[PDB]
Symmetry: C2
């Protein structure tokens, strides 16, 4: 259980990590047993989460935080990604437990899934 102010803190740090593009910042906010579900792929590790993040960031030329909201212990972040001149929209949901993200839920538009399945 975390206070409203507690969740807002991680939110601002998650927001700063996305915009500035520092991957180490993102990873430090994840719990060691963080569960990441995105599309058909699922990841159990925190170190595995970092691997998939960097594997995505190596194709992304431009990151842009569109909007950020906080619902209970969830932090939602709308992100636009530019890959090969093309823009894509992703939705991230970070569920926080004890000051760190315990679960990450990412929505992927059908056209994005193609790219993820292509540029894999």
């Amino acid at each position: 259980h975390m206070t409203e102010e507690e969740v807002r803190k991680i939110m601002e740090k998650l927001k700063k990590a996305f915009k500035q593009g520092n991957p180490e910042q993102i990873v430090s906010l994840l719990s060691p047993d963080v569960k990441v579900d995105v599309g058909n792929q699922s990841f159990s590790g925190s170190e595995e989460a970092e691997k998939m993040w960097r594997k995505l960031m190596k194709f992304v030329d431009r990151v842009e935080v569109r909007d950020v909201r906080v619902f209970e212990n969830a932090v939602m972040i709308a992100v636009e990604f530019e890959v090969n001149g093309q823009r894509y929209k992703m939705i991230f949901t970070f569920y926080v437990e004890n000051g760190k993200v315990s679960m990450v839920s990412i929505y992927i538009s059908p056209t994005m899934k193609k790219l993820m399945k292509q540029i894999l």
Copy 2:
């Protein structure tokens, strides 16, 4: 891509099915290829989703909606379930595509983890 007004209609239908009892409304909102992620388990297809949903709702003796919120194509519902005298907080995130729910993400309390394991297994 769906308009803000189109996502709100689904939200109200979702909100209504929670403020009321029947899960028969939520299954009608599900896409045939819907993906439900609860705990470490994932459920694919409306058939498996309607099964998992029904089994869970049969364990719940009381439902209270704490809050509802819309964010892009995502519908968030904060709920309190009561199973065997004990009460648990949960969050439902419904991702909408073309008027139906393509993906459902369910967060549960750590204290509900063992209990959720018994129901689904």
